C-alpha cells in the first residue's frame, strides 16, 4: 500500500546527525530524553519508599555502625528521573566523554569493600556506561588493590597500568604506573585492569 | 600618521607618507592579526592586535601576557596549595578547567626573600604568623575548656 | 629645542610643492612590524632573508605595535570551585611516612 | 529477589530501545578488554575539524558525570512490575 510521502533518507539523516553531534551539544540530551521517556512509559521500575539496605537488626547493631555508616554514605535515595536516565543512557549515544563522579576511598575499613561492590553492580546493571568510565573506575580500584592485595598489586602495576593493542591483536602493556584520565578514552590506551590477561 | 594616507588634503604630506608606506622596509596594519586556539576546546585564546600604541607600553603589555601564558600554571594547580592548608589526606576534585584558566606560578623566591626582609624589619610579624596558626587550631576544635 | 617634533607644517603652499622645513612623520612611526615568538616587538624586515630589527634595540619611536591580548574565553584570577572531601577517620590518617 | 525483573523484563526494554531510530552509534561490543568507540570527525581541507566525540569535561547538560551509586536505589528502594503478586 503506497504511502504518498518521500522515502526516509537514511544517508542524509545519518550525515545530519553526525553534523549535529559535531555542533549541537543539546543533541545528546535530546536523544537521551526520548530514551528516558520511553523507559518511563514502559513502567519497568518505580522507586518505593522503603529502603532495604540492611538485614533486620544489623542496622541497629552497635558493632555494625561503621559498615552501616558506609553503606549510608553510598546509598543515594531513589529518584525516578535519575534511575530512568541511568537506564536510558546505557543505550543512548555519548558525545562528550563521560567521567566517573570521583570517589575518595582509602580502603582501610573492610566496609570500604562496599565501593568495590558498587562498581561491580554498575558493571552488571550497566555494562556499556561502565565501559565508558572504566579507567576512571580503575583509579579507585587500584587504591583498593594496593591497600588490600599489595603484593599482587606490585606485580600487576609492574606489568603496567595500561596497554595498547597492536595489529596482531596482542595486548602491549606500558610497564608503567600512571593515573588514568578520560583523556585516554579516545586513544590507543586501555586500562590494564580489564585486560583480562592472566 | 599612516592612516592619513589618501585622506589628508596636504598633498606633500600624503605624497611622503605614501612613499614611506610603499617602501619594502615598512608596512602599516591594524589588528587583529595573530590568533591562537586551545588544543582541546578549539576556541580562540590569545590574539595579536596591531594597535596604534607606543612600542614601549606594547613591550610591557606583551611581557605581562607572556609571563602569564608561558607559566603553564592553570587554576587546577591551586589545589596543591589547598592541600598544604588542609588536614592531611583530604582530597580535592575538579573541575579540570585546563589552559583556559592560566595563572602565574607562585613566586617562592621573591616571597621568601621578602619574608626574610620583613622578619628583620618587623619582628612582630612573628605574632601575625603565630596568630594565623592559633586561629587554625581553634578551628580544629582539638581541645576545649571545661568547668570541671 | 624641538627634539620631540614628529611633524611640522601640515599645510599646503601655492608657490612650492612643500613648505620649506615641513617635517614628515618617520617611517618607524608607522611600521606596525610583528610580534616575535619571544614576545619582543620587531620592525618589518628591510629585505628578504633578514629578521626584523627589534623596536627596543633602536631609539626610534614606533606608534603601531602588535599587542597580544587574551579573549573572553581565557580568564585569569577568577575564583575556582572544588569539592573538598575530608578523611573518613582522623585516627586512620597517615602523618608519617615519606 | 529483583533478578527476574532485570533479566526477564528490563532486558527486553533494552532490546527494543536498541532499535529506536536515534540510537545510531555503536556503544560497546561486550568486550571491555578490546572495545573502543569508532571515531569520526567532520573535517575539511579548508581547515575545519570537529570531532563527534570529544572530552570537554563537565557540562550544563548534566550528562557528562555519572554517579554510580545509582545502583543502590535500584538494588534496594525500587519495586518492579515483576516483583510483585500480579501486575499487568
Amino acid at each position: 500500500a503506497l504511502r504518498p510521502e518521500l522515502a526516509f533518507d537514511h544517508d542524509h539523516i545519518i550525515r545530519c546527525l553526525m553534523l549535529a553531534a559535531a555542533n549541537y551539544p543539546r543533541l545528546e540530551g535530546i536523544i537521551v530524553q526520548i530514551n528516558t521517556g520511553y523507559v518511563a512509559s514502559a513502567n519497568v521500575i518505580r522507586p518505593v519508599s522503603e529502603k532495604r539496605y540492611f538485614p533486620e537488626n544489623l542496622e541497629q547493631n552497635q558493632s555494625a555502625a561503621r559498615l552501616v555508616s558506609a553503606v549510608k554514605a553510598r546509598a543515594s535515595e531513589a529518584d525516578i528521573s535519575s534511575i530512568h536516565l541511568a537506564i536510558a543512557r546505557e543505550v543512548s549515544p555519548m558525545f562528550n566523554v563521560h567521567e566517573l563522579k570521583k570517589i575518595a576511598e582509602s580502603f582501610e575499613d573492610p566496609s570500604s569493600i562496599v565501593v568495590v561492590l558498587e562498581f561491580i553492580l554498575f558493571a552488571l546493571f550497566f555494562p556499556t556506561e561502565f565501559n565508558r568510565i572504566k579507567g576512571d573506575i580503575q583509579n579507585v580500584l587500584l587504591l583498593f588493590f594496593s591497600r588490600w592485595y599489595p603484593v599482587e598489586y606490585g606485580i600487576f602495576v609492574q606489568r603496567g597500568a595500561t596497554y595498547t593493542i597492536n595489529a596482531a591483536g596482542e595486548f602491549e602493556f606500558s610497564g608503567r604506573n600512571e593515573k588514568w584520565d578520560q583523556a585516554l578514552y579516545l586513544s590507543e590506551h586501555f586500562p590494564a585492569l580489564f585486560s583480562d590477561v592472566p | 600618521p599612516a592612516l592619513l594616507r589618501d585622506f589628508t588634503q596636504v598633498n606633500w604630506l600624503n605624497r611622503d607618507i605614501t612613499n614611506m608606506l610603499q617602501q619594502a622596509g615598512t608596512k602599516y596594519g591594524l589588528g587583529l592579526t595573530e590568533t591562537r586556539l586551545d588544543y582541546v576546546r578549539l576556541v580562540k585564546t590569545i590574539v595579536g592586535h596591531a594597535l596604534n600604541i607606543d612600542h614601549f607600553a606594547a613591550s610591557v603589555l606583551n611581557i605581562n601576557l607572556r609571563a602569564l601564558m608561558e607559566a603553564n600554571v592553570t587554576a587546577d594547580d591551586r589545589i596543591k596549595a589547598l592541600q598544604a592548608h588542609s588536614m592531611i589526606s583530604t582530597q580535592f576534585h575538579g573541575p579540570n578547567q585546563g589552559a583556559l584558566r592560566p595563572e602565574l606560578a607562585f613566586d617562592h623566591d621573591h616571597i621568601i626573600r621578602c619574608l626574610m626582609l620583613a622578619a628583620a624589619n618587623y619582628p612582630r610579624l612573628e605574632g601575625i604568623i603565630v596568630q594565623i596558626n592559633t586561629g587554625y587550631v581553634a578551628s580544629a576544635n582539638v581541645i576545649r575548656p571545661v568547668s570541671e | 629645542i624641538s627634539v620631540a617634533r614628529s611633524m611640522r607644517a601640515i599645510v599646503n603652499h601655492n608657490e612650492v610643492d612643500r613648505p620649506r622645513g615641513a617635517v614628515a612623520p618617520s617611517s618607524y612611526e608607522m611600521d606596525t612590524g610583528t610580534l616575535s615568538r619571544n614576545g619582543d616587538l620587531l620592525y618589518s624586515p628591510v629585505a628578504n632573508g633578514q629578521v626584523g630589527i627589534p623596536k627596543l634595540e633602536v631609539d626610534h619611536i614606533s606608534f603601531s605595535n602588535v599587542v597580544s591580548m587574551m579573549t573572553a574565553n581565557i580568564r585569569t584570577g577568577d575564583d575556582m570551585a572544588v569539592e573538598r572531601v575530608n578523611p573518613d577517620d582522623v585516627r586512620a590518617i597517615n602523618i608519617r611516612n615519606a | 529477589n529483583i533478578a527476574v525483573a532485570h533479566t526477564d523484563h528490563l532486558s527486553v526494554v533494552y532490546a527494543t530501545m536498541s532499535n529506536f531510530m536515534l540510537n545510531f552509534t555503536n556503544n560497546f561490543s561486550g568486550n571491555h578488554a578490546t572495545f573502543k568507540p569508532d571515531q569520526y570527525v567532520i573535517t575539511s581541507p579548508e581547515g575545519s575539524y570537529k570531532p563527534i566525540i570529544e572530552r570537554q569535561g563537565e557540562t550544563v547538560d548534566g550528562l557528562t558525570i555519572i554517579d554510580t551509586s545509582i545502583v543502590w536505589p535500584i538494588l534496594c528502594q525500587c519495586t518492579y512490575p515483576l516483583v510483585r503478586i500480579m501486575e499487568e
Binding site: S76, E77, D79, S82, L85, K101 | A75, R78, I79, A81, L82, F92, H93, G94, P95, E103 | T76, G77, D78, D79, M80, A81, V82, E83, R84 | E58, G62, L63, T64, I65, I66, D67, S69, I70, P73
Partner: peptide
C-alpha cells in the same frame, strides 16, 4: 544522599 550527576563542589579557592 540524593543522586547528583555532576561535581558536588563546596570550597572556593582564591587565586
Amino acid at each position: 544522599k540524593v543522586i547528583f550527576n555532576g561535581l558536588d563542589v563546596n570550597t572556593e579557592v582564591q587565586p
